[PDB]
Design a protein around this ligand. Structure first.
Ligand SMILES: Cc1cc2nc3c(=O)[nH]c(=O)nc-3n(C[C@H](O)[C@H](O)[C@H](O)COP(=O)(O)OP(=O)(O)OC[C@H]3O[C@@H](n4cnc5c(N)ncnc54)[C@H](O)[C@@H]3O)c2cc1C
Ligand SMILES: COc1cc(=O)c2c(=O)c3c(c(=O)c=2c1=O)=C(O)[C@]1(O)c2c(cc4cc(C)oc(=O)c4c2O)CC[C@]1(O)C=3O
Length: 527
């Protein structure tokens, strides 16, 4: 009945549901909580992440849900929101059609929830994975519902999106490396009349510091929902269980600094700033994604972004394995591609935490990469692609403006037109294998036909040429070939996740194009 089980219906579990259901994979997701968390959590989604979301219709609604917060331009440090202000302060179109999506997770998640439900994913909230076993043939998972009733869900594969304390990762005996837990915090979600204390003021985030509370205070677009994130010191013997609703009300009220503002605590969650990365992201039929794979220090919001990229990477791979078009070893490439990225990003988070706390060495500041290089400039060291002979390999990240369609990299953004209507290379990707070809590369259509037929996998052919053709992509400014690092007679095979899989810099005479592409694609699909 149900073929991929996801554990966790936070960001990554749901990005997984949307991506698997996009690819016509039967998904059951389980989330122990009765819905998606009202806490804001990770608030910035970088252009690359937005592009990923574009492929499943999530960018436009998320951009719409984000304009409410676009006004929230001011960062400040205060004694209390009602008290004294101590301090207050206030991509680009050749690379990406997307901008930074300033949207809290509690707004992005319901969008992903809706889209997953539309694409036919089964989402069981208030449902807890107790334990699981895996054999040669699949995975058997014990689910306890809200009523306390248990059942065994049978799946081909299990995706662990169950967060930092992932009982799956632990059940599998996958350890973790990194600098570990830096600080322990509690997120306190509450309802309050922010307007009555804000006036015309709108903040992104407020640092609160007075005798009774230190912490990070956020308000939503509506000025009704707020979060207070506070430290606790286990050296003082403080823990989570000290954050009783009494205690939570007292902190929030001292952060507001009013008394007259009625506060309703909705929930507190524990939240650690940590650098901890799984040794392995794949254990036979279990795929570890998200905070379960990589706790990342939150400065730059790399965690939530990395985890959606995890979900995007593994999703089509599972779809290809489940449909018998890819060898089971295709999934191993999830680990090969995303673990180095996971580990690199987690360390990037630590550099940023160090640069922001003003405790970085010039070496930490030297090694800290632009967020666009971290999220868009990735060159997978190895995985589901075929490298170019002779062309020197890329490091893990580069300036994404220097990338020219090297296999293992984001197939570049090239502005096109179809019947006068704007488009890009990116609009072409996300649904299946895409073969793109230059002006002189008309023969590569037969090439795509042969490989598609030979291997039983769809290959959407598009020639990119600088003069019209009704319903044909027009290379408006004649950039495609240069941008993809091929001649006008060349071809570039793009994976479902928009990563370049293979290319021919030159044309291939006769059947050679078809034989080569078949072998290229046979390798990427582990066949
Ligand atoms: C309170 C809090 C505040 C945060 N604040 C920030 C922030 O300010 N900045 C930032 O960059 N990141 C922040 N994060 C982290 C961010 O939310 C994650 O990086 C992002 O959501 C990716 O995590 P994930 O979806 O993989 O896992 P998580 O977000 O941890 O979600 C894991 C989910 O798995 C579920 N689960 C666990 N065990 C089971 C089980 N047995 N059965 C079913 N479901 C299970 C949990 O209930 C949870 O919903 C915060 C997280 C929390 C919890
Ligand atoms: C020592 O110095 C620090 C240490 C930290 O450990 C730290 C930290 O951990 C931070 C943080 C910090 O400033 C610091 C910080 O100074 C925030 O600034 C933060 O990014 C943030 C939040 C919400 C929003 C909402 C909106 C719309 O837009 C934002 O711009 C926005 C955010 O940007 C919620 C908290 C946040 O995610 C975060 O975790």
């Amino acid at each position: 009945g149900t073929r991929v089980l996801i554990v966790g219906g936070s960001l990554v579990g749901l990005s997984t549901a949307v991506f698997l259901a996009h690819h016509d994979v039967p998904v059951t997701l389980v989330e122990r909580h009765p819905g998606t968390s009202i806490h804001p959590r990770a608030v910035g989604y970088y252009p690359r992440t937005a592009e990923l979301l574009a492929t499943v219709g999530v960018e436009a609604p998320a951009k719409a849900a984000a304009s409410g917060f676009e006004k929230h331009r001011t960062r400040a440090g205060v004694e209390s929101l009602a008290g004294e202000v101590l301090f207050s302060k206030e991509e680009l179109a050749d690379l990406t059609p997307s901008s930074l999506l300033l949207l809290p997770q509690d707004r992005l998640e319901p969008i992903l929830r809706a889209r997953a439900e539309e694409l036919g994913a089964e989402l069981r909230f208030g449902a807890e994975l107790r334990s699981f076993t895996q054999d040669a043939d699949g995975v058997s998972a014990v689910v306890r519902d809200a009523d306390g009733g248990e059942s065994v869900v049978r799946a081909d594969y299990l995706v662990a999106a169950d967060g930092p304390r992932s009982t799956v990762r632990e059940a599998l005996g996958i350890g973790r490396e990194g600098r570990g837990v830096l600080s322990r915090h509690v997120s306190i979600a509450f309802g309050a009349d922010f307007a009555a204390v804000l006036g015309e003021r709108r903040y992104s985030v407020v640092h609160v510091q007075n005798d009774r509370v230190t912490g990070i205070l956020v308000h939503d677009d509506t000025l009704t929902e707020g979060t207070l994130i506070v430290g606790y010191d286990p050296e003082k013997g403080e823990g989570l269980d000290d954050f009783t609703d009494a205690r939570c009300a007292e902190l929030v009220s001292a952060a507001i600094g009013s008394d007259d503002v009625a506060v309703t605590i909705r929930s507190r969650f524990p939240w650690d700033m940590a650098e901890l990365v799984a040794d392995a992201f794949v254990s036979d039929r279990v795929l570890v994604a998200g905070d379960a794979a990589h706790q990342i220090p939150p400065t730059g919001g790399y965690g939530a972004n990395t985890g959606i990229a995890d979900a995007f990477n593994l999703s089509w791979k599972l779809a290809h394995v489940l449909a018998g078009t890819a060898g089971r070893a295709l999934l191993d490439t999830y680990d090969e591609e995303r673990r180095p990225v996971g580990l690199y990003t987690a360390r990037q988070g630590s550099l940023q935490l160090a640069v922001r706390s003003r405790t970085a060495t010039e070496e930490q500041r030297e090694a800290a990469h632009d967020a666009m290089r971290v999220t868009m400039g990735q060159a997978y060291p190895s995985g589901a692609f075929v490298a170019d002979a002779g062309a020197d390999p890329l490091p893990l990240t580069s300036d994404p403006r220097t990338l020219r369609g090297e296999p293992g990299t984001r197939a570049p953004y090239v502005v096109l037109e179809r019947d006068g209507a704007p488009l890009s290379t990116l609009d072409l990707f996300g649904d299946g294998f895409v073969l793109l070809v230059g002006a002189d590369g008309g023969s590569w259509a037969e090439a795509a036909g042969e490989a598609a037929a030979g291997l039983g996998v769809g290959i959407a052919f598009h020639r990119v040429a600088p003069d019209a053709g009704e319903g044909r992509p027009v290379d408006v400014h004649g950039r495609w070939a240069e941008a993809y690092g091929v001649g006008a007679a060349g071809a570039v095979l793009v994976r479902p996740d928009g990563i370049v899989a293979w290319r021919s810099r030159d044309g291939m005479p006769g059947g050679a194009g078809g034989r080569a592409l078949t072998a290229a694609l046979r390798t990427v699909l582990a066949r």
